[PDB]
Amino acid sequence: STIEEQAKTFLDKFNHEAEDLFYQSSLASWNYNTNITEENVQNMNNAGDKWSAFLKEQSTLAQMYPLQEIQNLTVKLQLQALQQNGSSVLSEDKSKRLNTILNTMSTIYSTGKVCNPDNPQECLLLEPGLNEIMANSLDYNERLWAWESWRSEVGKQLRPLYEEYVVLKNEMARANHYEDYGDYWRGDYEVNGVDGYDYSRGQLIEDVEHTFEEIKPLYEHLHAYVRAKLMNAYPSYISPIGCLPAHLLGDMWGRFWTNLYSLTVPFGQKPNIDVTDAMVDQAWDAQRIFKEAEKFFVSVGLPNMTQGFWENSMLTDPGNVQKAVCHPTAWDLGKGDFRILMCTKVTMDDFLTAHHEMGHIQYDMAYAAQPFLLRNGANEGFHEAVGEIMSLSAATPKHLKSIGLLSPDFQEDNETEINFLLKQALTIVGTLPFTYMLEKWRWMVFKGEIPKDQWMKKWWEMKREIVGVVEPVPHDETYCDPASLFHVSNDYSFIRYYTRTLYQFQFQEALCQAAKHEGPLHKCDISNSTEAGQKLFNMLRLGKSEPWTLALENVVGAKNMNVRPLLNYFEPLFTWLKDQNKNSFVGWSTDWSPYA
Amino acid sequence: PNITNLCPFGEVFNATRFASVYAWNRKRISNCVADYSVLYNSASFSTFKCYGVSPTKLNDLCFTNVYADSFVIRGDEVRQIAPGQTGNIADYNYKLPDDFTGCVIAWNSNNLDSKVGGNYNYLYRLFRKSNLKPFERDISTEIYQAGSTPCNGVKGFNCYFPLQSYGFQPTYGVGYQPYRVVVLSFELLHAPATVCGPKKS
Ligand SMILES: *[C@@H]1O[C@H](CO)[C@@H](O)[C@H](O)[C@H]1NC(C)=O
Ligand SMILES: *[C@@H]1O[C@H](CO)[C@@H](O)[C@H](O)[C@H]1NC(C)=O
Ligand SMILES: *[C@@H]1O[C@H](CO)[C@@H](O)[C@H](O)[C@H]1NC(C)=O
Ligand SMILES: *[C@@H]1O[C@H](CO)[C@@H](O)[C@H](O)[C@H]1NC(C)=O
Ligand SMILES: *[C@@H]1O[C@H](CO)[C@@H](O)[C@H](O)[C@H]1NC(C)=O
Ligand SMILES: *[C@@H]1O[C@H](CO)[C@@H](O)[C@H](O)[C@H]1NC(C)=O
Ligand SMILES: *[C@@H]1O[C@H](CO)[C@@H](O)[C@H](O)[C@H]1NC(C)=O
């Protein structure tokens, strides 16, 4: 009869057939990932083509129902999600060119192999080897060689490709009624039609700048401390007044600073909280790791894993004969089928990763009651944030003592808390200026604020201004230094990590206040608290049905992303860094004082 | 006395194939001895919810006719086979009256009714203009008209096909795995009641 009832019936038929097709595609992808064989690749490609063609046909059929004649918010949300053209609005030649460019960038990044000139008989790929070289070497010129050679090869290959990519994506986005591709990415956080809880695409940049302005003193003190320690490690290269050299940050791009924990440890004399040896002594299998994670999730009141999870997941490397992707991934295949694909080792990192991925599985299970097109996080930040809160809670010494993995007579003094907080800052605080600078640069590239001849001159200027990292030698416009990273070269949004990092600590403060924890925030464990699990599950059950602002109101009681829980989390470390930086100079100079 | 001529409960519960929820099979059971304690004491049934009568006194009472309706539904759809409920199965596939006397028996059949490729032999009616009356069967395959435009027999815009398959695969969740449901309907009419329980000697 009415347009709204017509859309509801269309959504019902869509949901029903979509769930089945998405299941077939997801099962084909799972069979490819656990069994890398050419027929599995063919089956995955066939299922993906059927899924994409089906989404194209339903997008073509969904647009015939006008949005303004529908009053139910959930129906309007599903219709808004389905009615996106995507690349379909663009011409067939340009769509084919864009797909070809994306595929060739994926092949160039995945199969990029670089080794030293005059010794070309064998070469190393980034993921098997260059990562290990960047994370473990202590040699200045070796890291400089690896960094410059990989940015030379990858950037000189990817620069014309990225120049075509920005133009095609901007054309598609303006054809889709967006200002640029950056506005298309910022449209994930856009809430329209809800009274009071509306969020605009333009508010995201202002909120990110407003939060980063409060991030900046803590990052400045951490940067000064890391600069002093790197000056101790490398005597003459680092200046007291200047920025950090780019190739010394412990990773290939500067994404994380977690590989500098050995060089920058506050109290080396004190022991670490490594529990690897304790699990080795007690013969903890990966099955035991996941069962302990399940015990953690039932302690807080969340549902336990299904029988199909234990039957169908691959939690151990299969063997030599059968090949599988080693990356840990939680799979929501559809129809109540939840699996984890992780090559689990007996390490603390794998144990925390097991908690993180089972948190992903719990988030997926919670919104299974929702319609198919609303089965996602409220934004891209929440889905990762709910796994990261489990990673936060599991890493605490109280959780390790409770499950028996840590000795009951382990002394928790202030020094171990300081060095643990510094490790968490190197992982968590260090990625925030890099993430903000990368997204702001990509937004300015899409917006047209930066001309193509001035991309790199601005970029390093941004990196000195924001990240406090200086280039070793100047780069001209023949280089494409951003696109050496996985997310930017493969068309992925990058603001999810910044939002995830802030949402992580906001959720942590909310659950710890719910659990009546009486100490420091980093000493808080959310186990044994039914009310904390209930407060989490109230947001978890919604999925994408409600605005992310309303979900954040459900957890923390605020309508916007907030920066104060992160600063509260690192407050002991903040005071310690302020004490340790009395002689040294906090802040950096944008001049070429260390090296250029 | 000596009791023979048991009711054919083997051809309902232990059937090699079950019907879909839309074209649900109805078997009229008359003029035999119905032993309900064999069904109640089995551990193979997940749901044995009896409405309007208790299972303990079923083995004593006598009824004129017994209607055994058999079909296959999802795990999450077993709750809709009850008086007063709502959902696609109750509104469009199989409707129970509010004044229902009988038992709803359901058990998991993932072993038999699921194949790795997907078993599309079981269907459910997804749409219809009005809700079903109690104990009504709709096996029509006419194209549903959701819009003003006439369908004219072609599944185009706003015109969809009523019956949709459940692609039952063994790796599904417990709420999506196939469940075989047998509903026993007990009525008493003025005719001589002949479906009686077994009598002790
Ligand atoms: C992996 O693929 C091979 C291909 O020959 C097949 O024989 C094997 O059964 C598969 N293993 C699993 C666990 O599916
Ligand atoms: C919107 O539709 C859903 C079913 O799709 C229904 O449950 C919900 O109550 C509706 N909301 C309003 C406000 O009508
Ligand atoms: C998708 O593209 C078609 C083709 O021009 C257009 O008519 C339609 O309005 C577009 N949909 C949206 C949501 O912009
Ligand atoms: C999950 O918990 C319930 C109740 O505690 C239990 O019956 C069920 O067996 C558990 N699941 C598994 C896979 O053991
Ligand atoms: C730890 O506590 C002791 C005693 O309160 C104090 O002397 C020491 O300076 C503290 N260290 C740090 C890093 O806070
Ligand atoms: C949570 O509850 C279990 C069950 O009593 C208990 O063994 C465990 O120690 C509790 N956790 C903490 C941190 O006390
Ligand atoms: C059906 O099969 C089971 C399995 O062997 C058997 O125990 C039972 O007696 C059979 N008949 C009925 C009516 O359940």
Author numbering:
A (entry chain E): 19 to 614
B (entry chain B): 330 to 530
From the paper:
SARS-CoV-2 utilizes a trimeric spike glycoprotein for attachment to the host cell receptor angiotensin-converting enzyme 2 (ACE2) and for the subsequent cell entry step which involves the fusion of host cell and viral membranes. Given its crucial role in the viral replicative cycle, the spike protein represents an important therapeutic target and is a critical antigen in host immune responses. All emerging variants contain defining mutations within their spike proteins, with multiple mutations clustering within the receptor-binding domain (RBD) impacting both ACE2 binding and antibody neutralization escape, while mutations within the highly antigenic loops in the N-terminal domain (NTD) across these variants reduce antibody neutralization. Given the rapidly changing mutational and antigenic landscape of the SARS-CoV-2 spike protein, a structural understanding of spike protein mutational effects and the discovery of broadly neutralizing epitopes is of importance.
